[PDB]
Design a protein around this ligand. Structure first.
Ligand SMILES: *[C@@H]1O[C@H](CO)[C@@H](O)[C@H](O)[C@H]1NC(C)=O
Ligand SMILES: *[C@@H]1O[C@H](CO)[C@@H](O)[C@H](O)[C@H]1NC(C)=O
Ligand SMILES: *[C@@H]1O[C@H](CO)[C@@H](O)[C@H](O)[C@H]1NC(C)=O
Ligand SMILES: *[C@@H]1O[C@H](CO)[C@@H](O)[C@H](O)[C@H]1NC(C)=O
Ligand SMILES: *[C@@H]1O[C@H](CO)[C@@H](O)[C@H](O)[C@H]1NC(C)=O
Lengths: 49, 616, 340
């Protein structure tokens, strides 16, 4: 498999040991933008602009 | 530049027709930009003028030279989109305001969305049309009385109507059925208990410029001292806010204990029950056979769920130099100059004030009920609503049972999530968020080489580092000014709420004011006050009817001799071919007396004639 | 020796237009080369975006409080005013009543409120009807579309004007028909007689001058209704609030045309004349100036929301202690002799 690359910004999650477990691309969809704005993987219920 | 006729043949192109109705980028004879063109007939163009400017210096219209036509330029669309997202959903519901769905699916978005519909606010995506269904409360309010509800199953979101309040409907007539009116009168009643929380104080925060802008560097202080007294005003405003909070707390403490007189033979730990009413959950220590700390079970239950209390900040700041766990977000703020100071009065003496204020309404000389015992006081209060005294004097155990049941229900309701604890947590959450937002400003570059004084210092010479330090200084000063402005904006609402709390304590707890719809919801009887983290908790008791009965009444009669009578807080019923009097809140018939109605030397034609009432 | 009943009108401001400002679309540019420099300032837009959210939340909370104060302790009959006679004892109250029956939907404004809502243009529905015309083509000299394209918008409240008008008119019919929830169970003329007896007038004169009281009420209502043709003190504040809001919006929008020490007020000219190595020096001045302007605006909003809340609390207290009940406090609900 092959896929192209580009300079993008991601939100990464580190566990207690130091291994990356979760990653979110902040330019994929609207949920990703909400998670990037809140800097969390489980944002609260609400209406965002 | 970018306006003229001397073109360049370096990068040449081909002339194209001016398209209308599309957001395109133009290169018209030098002037560039993006917009939509529209053809319009104009007759205000001379031979020396070909472009139209606005009052601020913007191209709004122009005229072509090759076609001799006039066009008008309009800017393209640029706006945001609302996204309603639930707790653990997979895709939020989208809402484009003031835009129809026939415009966003072919000019803005190109994704095949199988769910889309127009509304009064605009276009909604990933939702269904369920306007015909109402809802009491919502968490995602859009506007104009519309809400979005998440239902676990198409689209899990539902676009419904928001109706927070209704009106009670009673199936009765409105017209006069033979000169009488059909009204519902209660038959069986009870005592209900409500609770509310009013914020009084605010956390006292102190900031120091000697550690926020310049931590310990001398070259930073040399540039900070050039501005002058720009940092003294911050400390002055903080001290003024702290003094205002202290004065407010002292005024509240004075309003709590004002005229209270208690007996010296009460410190026995046994005088806690009167009229078979349990008040152990409201009273604490009163005397000398206790320790330093003393609260009530309700106050303890309220404080056990709030960690950032008065003693919480002290216990957190104490664990900063030990070595157990210094990774908390409290010591890092104290190491930079932001410190929370405790108030003058502690949460223990205010508990004693509330306990004394509660006892003042239980035992002689009854300094909180004008010298009237508690059962007689509550009986007079419930009689003032328009009930008979006989049913009150005959049923005294039911009143105490209802009081005990309401108190137990209020005590048990704290296990759930009410609005009082919600606000008590929200205030401290907002305070913590403000502190974190103020602390995060120390890691911003503010248009410099690095967001750190050491990296700027040990990378260049002072002549090239002065500007880099000045940028950070200006940024941090602006942040401090914004924080001071926010604190000054919040202290006003804090003081207003505290004044309202003082007024409610003075006119609802210590005294029984005749102001209706002030201490309760029209049927208010009494209220009690307790302490709570950063505020007071008011427990009100109200008169709640249970059963009802329809009855025909008449608002006054006409006696014999051109004289009229009118009821006082009641009605006239016709029972057993005779006119009797009933209360406005109970259905105990009683004969008409002198001290029950009001007389008048003339009666109108609307009153019902009854010349057989010889009760003079 | 002889008396009459006079009428007076007062206006109390309760709400305010919720203004929302977009950061990235206003302070730097609508382009993309400015965001790479704007991201160097850190999280500066978060405070500006949160202040407006807190102000809007406070406005929603106080609006819900006003609604609760208007809709508390109201019990009406099922056979409501369905084209029923809106007069009680020769007292015409049709001018201040809408419709609350099974029919007559999507419209609940009274004829009195129509005269007030027709003299203003920037109402709750005004912004909605003026913002959806920018796509299909609005007026060429329209400023609202430009303000919306620059990131300045006005959001509607959580409750529409029709719902508030219905909640208000549901309280007027309370003390007109059984049961009288707004008069503690006392009929309207008997309540008026009781409230006017407290001044000193005996019942012998009141029981013989009921038609006089009815005619006085009708004449006062007609005069209050006709006084809207001129410019009274009530409409003056309503117009002044909108004028001040529009002036503030225009002053905030005008900041985009300043130089702030740079060579031009538009980034299109700067990016078409200089290179990136000599562009940040010019863009930083504009960024700082617009950030200072936004900070001043949010500070003014935080300063005005306090007075807004104070006025709303005053209105709530007046509603709770003047119309829905009879408070024995002189010189509070009116100018001395208060009857209703
Ligand atoms: C939207 O798209 C349609 C068809 O693609 C086109 O005819 C119309 O001019 C477009 N409108 C705008 C404002 O771009
Ligand atoms: C446009 O108007 C000018 C002014 O008379 C004229 O000289 C020129 O020929 C016109 N061009 C066209 C294409 O009609
Ligand atoms: C109004 O009615 C709805 C629907 O029955 C209900 O959910 C809501 O709790 C009611 N509100 C009040 C204040 O009675
Ligand atoms: C009122 O209700 C209580 C509890 O249901 C009952 O014990 C009492 O007898 C009732 N009184 C009347 C008058 O119905
Ligand atoms: C009535 O007197 C008895 C006898 O001491 C007492 O226990 C009870 O609490 C009193 N009740 C009231 C309402 O005073």
């Amino acid at each position: 498999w092959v896929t192209p690359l580009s300079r993008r910004q991601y939100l990464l999650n580190f566990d207690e040991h130091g291994v990356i477990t979760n990653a979110v691309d902040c330019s994929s969809s609207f949920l990703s933008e909400i998670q990037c704005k809140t800097q969390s993987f489980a944002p609260n219920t609400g209406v965002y602009d | 530049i970018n306006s003229g006729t001397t073109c360049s043949n370096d990068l040449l192109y081909s002339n194209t027709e001016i398209s209308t109705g599309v957001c395109v980028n133009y290169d018209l004879y030098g002037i560039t930009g993006q917009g939509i063109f529209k053809e319009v007939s104009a007759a205000y163009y001379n031979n020396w003028q070909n472009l139209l400017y606005d009052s601020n210096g913007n191209i709004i219209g122009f005229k072509d030279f090759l076609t001799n036509k006039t066009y008008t330029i309009l800017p393209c669309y640029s706006g945001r989109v609302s996204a309603a997202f639930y707790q653990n959903s997979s895709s939020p519901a989208l809402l484009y305001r003031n835009l129809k769905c026939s415009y966003v699916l072919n000019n803005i978005s190109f994704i095949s969305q199988p769910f889309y519909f127009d509304s009064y606010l605009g276009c909604v995506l990933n939702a269904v049309n369920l306007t015909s269904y109402s809802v009491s409360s919502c968490d995602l309010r859009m506007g104009s009385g519309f809400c979005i509800d998440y239902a676990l199953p198409s689209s899990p979101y539902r676009f419904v109507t928001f109706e927070p309040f209704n009106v009670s409907f009673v199936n009765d007539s409105v017209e006069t059925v033979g000169g009488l009116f059909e009204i519902q009168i209660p038959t069986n009643f009870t005592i209900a208990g409500h609770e509310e929380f009013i914020q009084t104080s605010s956390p006292k925060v102190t900031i120091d410029c000697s550690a926020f802008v310049c931590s310990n560097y001398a070259a930073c202080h040399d540039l900070l001292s050039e501005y002058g007294t720009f940092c003294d005003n911050i400390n002055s405003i903080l001290n003024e806010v702290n003094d205002l909070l202290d004065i407010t707390q002292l005024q509240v403490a004075n309003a709590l204990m004002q005229g209270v007189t208690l007996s010296s033979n009460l410190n026995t730990n046994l005088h806690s029950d009167v009229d078979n009413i349990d008040f152990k959950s409201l009273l604490g220590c009163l005397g000398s056979q206790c320790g330093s700390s003393s609260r009530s079970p309700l106050e303890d239950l309220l404080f056990n769920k709030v960690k950032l209390s008065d003693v919480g900040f002290v216990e957190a700041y104490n664990n900063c130099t030990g070595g157990s766990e210094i990774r908390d977000l409290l010591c890092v703020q104290s190491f930079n100059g932001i410190k929370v100071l405790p108030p003058i009065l502690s949460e223990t003496q205010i508990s004693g004030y509330t306990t004394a204020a509660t006892v003042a309404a239980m035992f002689p000389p009854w300094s909180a009920a004008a010298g009237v015992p508690f059962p007689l006081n509550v009986q007079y209060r419930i009689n003032g609503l328009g009930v008979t005294m006989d049913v009150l004097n005959k049923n005294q155990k039911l009143i105490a049972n209802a009081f005990n049941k309401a108190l137990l229900s209020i005590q048990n309701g704290f296990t759930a999530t009410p609005s009082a604890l919600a606000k008590i947590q929200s205030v401290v959450n907002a305070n913590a968020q403000a502190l974190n937002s103020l602390l995060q400003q120390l890691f911003n570059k503010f248009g410099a080489i690095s967001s750190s004084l050491q990296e700027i210092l040990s990378r260049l010479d002072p002549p090239e580092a002065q500007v880099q330090i000045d940028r950070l200084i200006n940024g941090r000063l602006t942040a401090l000014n914004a924080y001071v402005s926010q604190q000054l904006s919040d202290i006003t609402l804090i003081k207003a709420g505290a004044s309202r709390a003082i007024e409610k304590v003075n006119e609802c707890v210590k005294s029984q004011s005749p102001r209706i719809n002030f201490c309760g919801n029209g049927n208010h009887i009494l209220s009690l006050v307790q302490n709570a983290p950063y505020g007071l908790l008011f427990i009100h008791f109200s008169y709640k009817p249970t059963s009802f009965k329809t009855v025909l009444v008449s608002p006054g009669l006409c006696l014999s001799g051109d004289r009229g009578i009118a009821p006082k807080q009641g009605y006239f019923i016709k029972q057993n071919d005779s006119w009797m009097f009933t209360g406005s809140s109970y259905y105990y018939p009683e004969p008409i007396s002198d001290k029950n109605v009001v007389f008048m030397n003339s009666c109108s034609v609307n009153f019902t004639k009854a010349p057989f009432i010889y009760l003079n």
